[PDB]
Short mmCIF file of C-alpha atoms in Angstrom, two decimals:
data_model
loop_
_atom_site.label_atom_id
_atom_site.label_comp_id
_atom_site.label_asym_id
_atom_site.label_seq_id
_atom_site.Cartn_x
_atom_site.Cartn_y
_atom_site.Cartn_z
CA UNK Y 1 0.00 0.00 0.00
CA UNK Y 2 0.98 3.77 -0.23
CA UNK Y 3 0.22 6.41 2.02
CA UNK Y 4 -2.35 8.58 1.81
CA UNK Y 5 -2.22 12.47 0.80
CA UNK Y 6 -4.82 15.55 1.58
CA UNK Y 7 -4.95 16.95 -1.81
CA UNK Y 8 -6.47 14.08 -3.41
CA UNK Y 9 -8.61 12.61 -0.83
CA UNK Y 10 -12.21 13.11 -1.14
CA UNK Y 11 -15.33 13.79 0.65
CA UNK Y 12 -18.74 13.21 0.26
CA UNK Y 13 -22.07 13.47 2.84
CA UNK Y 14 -25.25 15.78 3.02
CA UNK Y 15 -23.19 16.88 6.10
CA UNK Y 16 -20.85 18.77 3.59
CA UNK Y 17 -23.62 21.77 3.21
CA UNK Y 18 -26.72 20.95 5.22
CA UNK Y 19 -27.41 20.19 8.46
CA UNK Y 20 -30.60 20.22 10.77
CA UNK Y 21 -30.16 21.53 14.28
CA UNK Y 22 -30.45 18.94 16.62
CA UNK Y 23 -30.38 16.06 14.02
CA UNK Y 24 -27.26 14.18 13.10
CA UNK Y 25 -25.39 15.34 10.39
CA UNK Y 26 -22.95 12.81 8.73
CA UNK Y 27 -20.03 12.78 5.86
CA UNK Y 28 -18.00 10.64 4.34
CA UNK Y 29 -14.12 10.72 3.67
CA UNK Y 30 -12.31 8.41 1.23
CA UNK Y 31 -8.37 9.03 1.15
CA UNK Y 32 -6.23 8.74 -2.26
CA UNK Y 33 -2.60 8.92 -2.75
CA UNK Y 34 -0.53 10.83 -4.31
CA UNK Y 35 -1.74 9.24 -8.33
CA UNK Y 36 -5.31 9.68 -7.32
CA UNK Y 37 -5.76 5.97 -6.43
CA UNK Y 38 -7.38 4.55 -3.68
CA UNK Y 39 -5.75 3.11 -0.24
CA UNK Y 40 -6.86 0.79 1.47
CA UNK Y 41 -5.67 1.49 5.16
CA UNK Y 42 -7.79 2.43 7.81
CA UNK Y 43 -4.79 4.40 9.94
CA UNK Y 44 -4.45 7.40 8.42
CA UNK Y 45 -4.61 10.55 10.87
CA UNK Y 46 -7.85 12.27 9.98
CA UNK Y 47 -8.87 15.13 12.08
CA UNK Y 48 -12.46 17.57 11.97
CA UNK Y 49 -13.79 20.73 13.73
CA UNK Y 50 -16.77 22.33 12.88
CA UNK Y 51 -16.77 26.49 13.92
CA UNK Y 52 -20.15 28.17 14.43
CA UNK Y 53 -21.34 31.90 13.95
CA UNK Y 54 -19.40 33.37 17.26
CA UNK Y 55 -15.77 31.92 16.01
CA UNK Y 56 -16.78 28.79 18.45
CA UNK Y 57 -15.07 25.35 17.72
CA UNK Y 58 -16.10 22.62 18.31
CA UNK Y 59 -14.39 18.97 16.94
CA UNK Y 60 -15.87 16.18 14.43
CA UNK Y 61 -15.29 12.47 15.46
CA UNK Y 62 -14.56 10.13 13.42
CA UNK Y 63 -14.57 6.79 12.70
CA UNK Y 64 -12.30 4.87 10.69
CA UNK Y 65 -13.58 1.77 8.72
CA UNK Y 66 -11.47 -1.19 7.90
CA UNK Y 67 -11.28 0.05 4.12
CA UNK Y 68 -9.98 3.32 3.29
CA UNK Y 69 -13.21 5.20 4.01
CA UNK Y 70 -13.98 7.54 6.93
CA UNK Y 71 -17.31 8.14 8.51
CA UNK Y 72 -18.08 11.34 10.39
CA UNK Y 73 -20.80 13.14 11.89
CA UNK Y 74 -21.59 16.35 14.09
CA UNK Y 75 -24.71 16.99 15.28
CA UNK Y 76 -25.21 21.13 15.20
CA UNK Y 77 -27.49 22.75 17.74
CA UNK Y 78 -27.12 26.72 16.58
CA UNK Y 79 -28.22 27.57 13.47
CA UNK Y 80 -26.29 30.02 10.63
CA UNK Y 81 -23.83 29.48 8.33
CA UNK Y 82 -20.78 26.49 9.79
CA UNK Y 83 -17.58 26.46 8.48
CA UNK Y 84 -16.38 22.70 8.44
CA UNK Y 85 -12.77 21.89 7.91
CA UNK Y 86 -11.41 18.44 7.38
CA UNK Y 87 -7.23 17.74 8.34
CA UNK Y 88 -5.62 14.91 6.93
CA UNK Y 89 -1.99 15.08 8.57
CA UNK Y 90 -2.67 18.39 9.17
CA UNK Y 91 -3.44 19.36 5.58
CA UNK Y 92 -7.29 20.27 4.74
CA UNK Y 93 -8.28 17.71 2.14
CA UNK Y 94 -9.82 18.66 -0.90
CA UNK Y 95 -12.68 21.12 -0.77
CA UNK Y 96 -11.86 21.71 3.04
CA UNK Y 97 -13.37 24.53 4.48
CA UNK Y 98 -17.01 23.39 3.81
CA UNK Y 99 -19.39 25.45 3.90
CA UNK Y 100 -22.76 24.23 5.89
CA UNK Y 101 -25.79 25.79 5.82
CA UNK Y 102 -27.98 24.63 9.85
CA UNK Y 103 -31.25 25.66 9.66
CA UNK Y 104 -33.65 25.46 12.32
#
């Protein structure tokens, strides 16, 4: 296997740009080396925080599957605009700030 980079690791969720107050909202992260292909190993150091309207963060847990695919959800309880930002060593992966809309 190779190790996996932040520039070509994707995400994908509803969680990305819409999320309920009070309801789970959840993402998905799939890490890629450095050629775009896929890896396979579920130890690769994947950090989240989600910041609210007043500057507050406040982190995104995650769960690493067995494959190379990363399952995370927040649940947000203030509404506005959230600024979501995924780190994989560090780097934001690609499309990292997100930009989520919590209604309600």
């Amino acid at each position: 296997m190779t190790s996996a980079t932040a520039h070509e690791t994707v995400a994908t969720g509803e969680g990305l740009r819409q999320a309920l107050v009070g309801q789970p909202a959840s993402l998905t992260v799939t890490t890629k080396d450095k050629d775009g292909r896929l890896v396979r190993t579920g130890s690769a150091e994947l950090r989240a925080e989600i910041t609210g309207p007043d500057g507050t963060r406040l982190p995104v847990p995650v769960v690493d599957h067995k494959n190379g695919t990363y399952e995370l959800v927040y649940t947000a309880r203030t509404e506005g605009e959230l600024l979501l930002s995924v780190l994989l060593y560090g780097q934001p992966v690609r499309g990292s700030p997100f930009r989520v809309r919590a209604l309600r």
